[PDB]
């Protein structure tokens, strides 16, 4: 029922050359390319209602505020959270999860207490634990790993404990592409007294979400990976903590009373949304949830659970290639070439236009636990097609014979 | 020099009608309008070299960070910083004041310290300190204003103590208009052993800035009100202080190693910047910088000061009308109406077609100094006109009498 020639057709970006090669962009899961109707969206803000939002005072503002708010109703709509007042707009993942850390964690962790993560978190989701525990004296604990780098329930039993006040996880893994069990994990963390805290950028852009489904206490997701605009993302978070929780910023905007030397706040969600907001990005964001709802998520979920068998069994044709992780994956694939370093892979690929990753991908501990120095990656997303993992097979096998070739050659 | 067809002929969004009256924009002191330049800049981005920055592996990563880091240089040089690793990019002014407040302030103060702000101050540049006060038991302390809301040296000598360790000011006041003498409170700060906190806000988009000869040791700015995307802003802070402040937020993209549970961070000025950047909005800030930089910042500065003083005059033929502030000042004009509520005189405005801004304007205890609960504004850059502000005074002029008459129908 997708098209993806006709979903390609929207994204001016991919339809050009790099070294004299057709594009191939398989780097989504590090930023994710624009349809028309996001860009254009963004355009129409600036070309006819640019205003300042929330004084409903003359007409630009008002269409400026609609748009907002509007915008603030459609991702709550996205992720069915039960009310706008748990939809906070942020600069992104890591400035949400931020949030949670500086107003929740530090506000609610005390000696003995602990937060609980997994060894294979984007840094995002490690270090804002590492500075909340360090404030507060708590103590960070790490949930296993199985050697598919799956995890266990039974593992998460054992870690979390009746001292456990926060367990963070990610919901897809950038890395491993591992899809955790998280509404399992919620119920896990909830009978031992603990918030659960998602890390949802590499799950948001892929597959339908449910906060009430899977019952997390916080979600953090990022626009530029789901064919938003760059610099915005959201928190979600249950309207219960969130009214308990202090500002994680201050200034206009957030406050209902300014005195000399003490001031009240808005309610949810201004309360958390110091300053002029991310206007045109926010809304921008909007057009894209509008997009991706147009496609459907489950069907650009089997696209990329499609796309992502596919290249497991071209990888598994080469080889010399070592690929990480389970079987049952989203749309991205992290591997090596045996003796190249995968700079060296990212770069080669890049002369015939293959555009991927390499490096820690912001998972040093994962890369440690994966016995590695680094990695090469490559990911998938509704604009790819199964011609373009060909090309990247063929391209990963032509590097292989050519860093072979220069080995015999040095004589 | 500067022909205002011309810069309005830029700004697709003035030509267009609202309540069947041509657009007449007075609400730059809120937010600003952007010309092409910066929309095709953000257009371009998105249609052709979209990516993530800082990996340097396949084209367009390198074209994205080409044009971040260029952006970076762009703003280092528009406020004559010495280095980039003193130009942060943040979500906006609100946000740089709290990194300040939070790395600096919250780090550096002890009970007994002073921190001194004045009574003109915007919220985003009263709150944080509020906070980070409240949070050291340090006190806060405010500089009294002059009768004409300017601010005097001798108060500021007063005020600022050995004890002081911030001075926190407003270069330009979005609601008085005031231009205050950073420059010598600078000084003052300095010899009493403080640093001194600049919010530029209001005085960036429309007057030169010279970070080296305010010898300011931050200043905050937002693009928004200067032609720039919504969502993003500098920090500017001297490489000393910022080398030994902690981040204000963690995650990928500001460490360098990563541990289980330590982490070390990047150098400057990556080290406070946590996450995927605002890699758009950036870039379109810095083709905002070299829109203003070919009109020139003096000749901006010159028609806001003919603009100005044409509308005080306009305003002083005006009975009944009350201006606040002092004669020397930025492009705009806060007053109310003899009589009638603000509110009402900016919704009467908008049916018009006249975009002003009424309420507290983020300064309430500058609004509790003036005596008034409220206060109406009018706001003037780059693409206004004496003839808007015509517009204005006459839309003024019918307002008090229709106030009149409708105070003489009631029978």
Redesign the interface.
Known sequence: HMNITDIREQF??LH?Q??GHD?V?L?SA??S??PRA??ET??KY???????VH?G?????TRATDGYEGAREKVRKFINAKSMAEIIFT?????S??MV?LSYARANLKPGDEVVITYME???????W??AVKATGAT?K?IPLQEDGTISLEDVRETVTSNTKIVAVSHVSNVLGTVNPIKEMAKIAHDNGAVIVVDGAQSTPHMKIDVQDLDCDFFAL?S?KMCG????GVLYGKKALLENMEPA?????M?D???????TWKELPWKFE????????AIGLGAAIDFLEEIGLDEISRHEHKLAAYALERFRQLDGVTVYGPEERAGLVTFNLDDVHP?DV??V??AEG??????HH?A??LMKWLDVTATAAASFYLYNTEEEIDKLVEALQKTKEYFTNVFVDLE
């Open positions: 001016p970006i050009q790099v070294n594009l962009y780097d590090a930023t390319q624009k996001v860009i963004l355009d600036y070309n006819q209602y640019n205003s300042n004084r005072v003359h007409t630009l503002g600069k992104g993942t890591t400035t999860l931020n850390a984007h840094h995002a989701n490690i270090i804002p590492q500075q960070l790490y990022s530029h605009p760059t610099g915005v910023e201050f200034g206009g905007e406050i009373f300014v005195g000399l030397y003490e001031s110091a300053g002029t907001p991310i206007i045109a990005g700079h990212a770069t690929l890049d293959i555009a991927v990753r390499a490096g912001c040093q501990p």
